[PDB]
Structure formats: structure tokens, C-alpha cells
Amino acid sequence: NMIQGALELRTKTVEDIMTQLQDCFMIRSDAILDFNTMSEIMESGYTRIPVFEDEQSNIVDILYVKDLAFVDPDDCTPLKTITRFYNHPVHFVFHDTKLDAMLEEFKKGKSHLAIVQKVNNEDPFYEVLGLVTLEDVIEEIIKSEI
Amino acid sequence: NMIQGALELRTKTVEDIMTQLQDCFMIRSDAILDFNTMSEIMESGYTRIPVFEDEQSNIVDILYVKDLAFVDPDDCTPLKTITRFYNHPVHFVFHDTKLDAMLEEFKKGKSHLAIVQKVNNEGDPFYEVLGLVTLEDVIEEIIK
């Protein structure tokens, strides 16, 4: 039993865990932080929000919502200021990657949020299927062993 | 790797993971939101701050720092107004609770900060507040 849960964990990929891109809450890099955008970001509940340029599949920066604390919606400062400030390293991963290697990347200090990419032959280009995070990994651990 | 994470997940008690109370960053519930207060909350780096009344051991509320988005410090807004307005839940947990079980409690939708309680027989017995443990604390203790 412990064996089956263990290797069933070890056999999953990020594709099988990751929240799908269409169910993720993202934000356009051009966006300005006004009461509507701000309120939306809060109401979303996500602590880390992807910031993408143009097409949804190209993710430039990452927004930590605690950083919106002092932003006043009356100043209407664009999120572009914030993301162009940070330039957090974006974390990319192959869709076939096993969870143990993922846990290695997280142990080495990489961003706890990671973006799932697959080579699309349909020249081949890299498409973004969605997002997986360390919390999803550990969730799979404690779920699958029981 | 996965095995190491699961095993360390089921051995460690939240007491081992926890941040002691004396070293916590808390805020009194009567505090007001002027520049020193907001600047302190910002430089603390905590995303969820415990809110207490009288002694530090009595933790009445929780402040999600992101709420503070809609406050301005020139208003001198009482933290009591915010705490009464959102009414966020406080989470208590037994000092013997294993880490994975704690992940189950947080996963149920409870606040991602949890207060660790011990039973104290040493002088009528009472429940004792040792500190707090956060979901982030748990995950960090898995990757180390």
C-alpha cells in the first residue's frame, strides 16, 4: 500500500497536478491599479498573481499581493511600475517533470510558483498549459499516501 | 526526496516548526494606523499579523495585511475598525498535531496562521499559548 501510494506519487507529472491556465487568475501587464483592479485582485484571494504581456501564454513578471498594501487606487499607478521594478525570476518547467525533481528545484531556492511548458509540434514552439506550485506538490504528497 | 518530505511531514510536531511567542510580531488591537504603524507592518514582512488584547497571550483577531490596501495612514484609522469590519477567523491547534494534519486544517479554508496551545497542569489547569505556526512555516520545513 505504502509502495503503491509512493510510486503512484513518483509517477505523476506536473501536468497531472497543475491548476489549468484557464482556471488561473492572471493580470495584464499594461493594467493600472485602480479601485476596480485592486478590489478584483483582493477578491481573487490568490497571494501570487501572474503578470503577462500581450498573449496570456507569455508571462513576464509575478505580482505578490502584499506589495499592493500602500498603493492608493486614487493615484492609479500602473502595475507596470511594480513589475518593471521587481523582475522576479520566472520559473519554468517541462510538463513531463516528476515531482521529486520539482521538490529539488524548490529546495535549491527557486520561486514556489512554477509555470508549465510543453513543446508543441502542431517549427515547434513552447506553449503554456498552466501553473503548479509547491503547495500543490505537498498536497499531492499528503493526499496520495493515505 | 518525496519520501523524505512525507516522513519529515509526519514526524515533526508544530511545536518543533513553530515560532515562539516572545519572538512573534504581534499588534495590539487598539493600535492606530499612522505612519510608524504602517511602516512597521510593512518592514515586518508578515502577510498575516496576530491581533491581541491586553496580554500577548490573548489573541482575539487576525489582520490580513493585504486588506490594508484600502487604508491610508493619514486617516489614522483604528485597527479595531478593520478587525471588526473583516472579522477574520482565528485558528488554534494542539501542540502535538503533526505537520500533515496541520496542512489538512489549513486546506479546509482556515486562516493560514495557527496558534499552538498546550495543556498546563502546573498550578485549575488551563490552555497555554506557546506560539504560532503558519502554512509557510510548514512548507519551509519540508524543503529543508
Author numbering:
A (entry chain C): 360 to 481, 485 to 508
B (entry chain B): 360 to 482, 485 to 505
What does the paper say about this structure?
The Cyclin and CBS domain divalent metal cation transport mediators (CNNMs) are the most recently identified proteins involved in magnesium cation (Mg2+) transport across the cell membranes. The four known members (CNNM1 to CNNM4) encoded in the human genome are integral membrane proteins with strong homology to CorC, a bacterial magnesium/cobalt efflux protein. Structurally, the CNNMs are complex multidomain proteins that consist of four independent domains connected by linkers of different length. The intracellular region is directly attached by a long α-helix (H0) and comprises two distinct domains, a Bateman module and a cyclic nucleotide monophosphate binding-like domain (cNMP domain).
The CNNM4BAT domain is formed by two consecutive CBS motifs, CBS1 (residues 371–435) and CBS2 (436–505), that present a αβαββα fold and contact each other via their three-stranded β sheets, resulting in an overall pseudo-C2 symmetric structure. The N-terminal connecting helix H0 packs against helices H3 and H4 of CBS2. As in other CBS domain containing proteins, CNNM4BAT features two major symmetry-related clefts, S1 and S2, formed between their stacked β-sheets (central right panel). Of note, an acidic cluster (E497, D498, and E501) at the N-terminus of α-helix H4 in S2 replaces the positively charged residues found in S1 (R407, K425, H471, T406). As observed in other CBS-domain containing proteins, including CNNM2 and CNNM3, CNNM4BAT self-associates into a disk shaped head-to-head dimer commonly referred to as “CBS module” (upper and central right panels) where both CBS1 and CBS2 pack against their equivalent in the complementary subunit. In CNNM4, this disk is semi-twisted and both CBS1 motifs are slightly separated. This particular CBS module represents an intermediate state between the apo form of CNNM2, where the separation between complementary CBS1 motifs is more pronounced (“twisted” conformation), and its MgATP bound holo form, where the disk appears planar (“flat” conformation). In the semi-twisted conformation, the CNNM4BAT dimer interface is stabilized by an extensive network of hydrophobic interactions. Upon dimerization, the H0 helices from complementary CNNM4BAT subunits lie crossed, as observed in the twisted conformation of CNNM2BAT, and participate in the CBS2 dimer interface via their residues N360, M361, I362, A365, and L368.
